[PDB]
Amino acid sequence: RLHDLRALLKRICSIQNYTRHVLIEWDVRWVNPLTLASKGWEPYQSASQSQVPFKCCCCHAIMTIPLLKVADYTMKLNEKIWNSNIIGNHLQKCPWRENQVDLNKEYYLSSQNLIREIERIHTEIDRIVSFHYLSEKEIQKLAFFFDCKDYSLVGLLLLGYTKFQKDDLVQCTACFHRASLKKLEYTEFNGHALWCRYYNKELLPTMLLELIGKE
Ligand SMILES: [Zn+2]
Ligand SMILES: [Zn+2]
């Protein structure tokens, strides 16, 4: 399937993985791991200090993202790259040229896919039994809805994270940034990319609370 969520997520994850040893100036609209993945692009080879190559999973066509050490022309350049490379480099009849994953429907939060977040949180809690930024009033209700006594775990999962290593590392499920639990203890620090589903921390808990009020 072209719009399969799991394939999109794995493309995003691989892009983030091979980009870790490099700093890239993404933008929320034109060029970012999300838009690349939504257009079927996967990492092709290891990126040099100057350019990051990608290959289409159907075409096998190659595109490249430049690197510079910047803010003056990022917008115009990235819009050009989106039109000419992320779309253009596709072969004429490749499905990814004229089609794109519906990110609003499948990736970003909506009332029709909030249940997936509920499932994720419940599954994480079950696998465990097997971060305060909301009012005590609110976290009480959120923890109650998930039948969980550990408020901090509920908050952490509401931030979209999941444990990564035996170490203090924790990884986001939608943008795959890595943060230390020590960082998130008593800090406003937002570890998400600007384009992440969870970048606005209050969005998911707010939708969940509004859902609670309607039951
Ligand atoms: Zn293609
Ligand atoms: Zn994230």
Residue numbers in the entry: 79 to 147, 152 to 212, 227 to 311
Quote the authors verbatim.
In Saccharomyces cerevisiae, the pre-mRNA leakage 39-kDa protein (ScPml39) was reported to retain unspliced pre-mRNA prior to export through nuclear pore complexes (NPCs). Both zf-C3HC and Rsm1 modules belong to the Zn-containing BIR (Baculovirus IAP repeat)-like super family, with key residues of the canonical BIR domain being conserved.
Based on the domain boundaries identified by mass spectrometry, we generated a truncated ScPml39 construct comprising residues 77–317 for structural studies. ScPml3977–317 contains two BIR-like modules: zf-C3HC (residues 79–189 in blue) and Rsm1 (residues 190–311 in purple). Cys134, Cys137, His172, and Cys176 residues coordinate Zn to form the C-x2-C-x–H-x3-C ZnF motif.
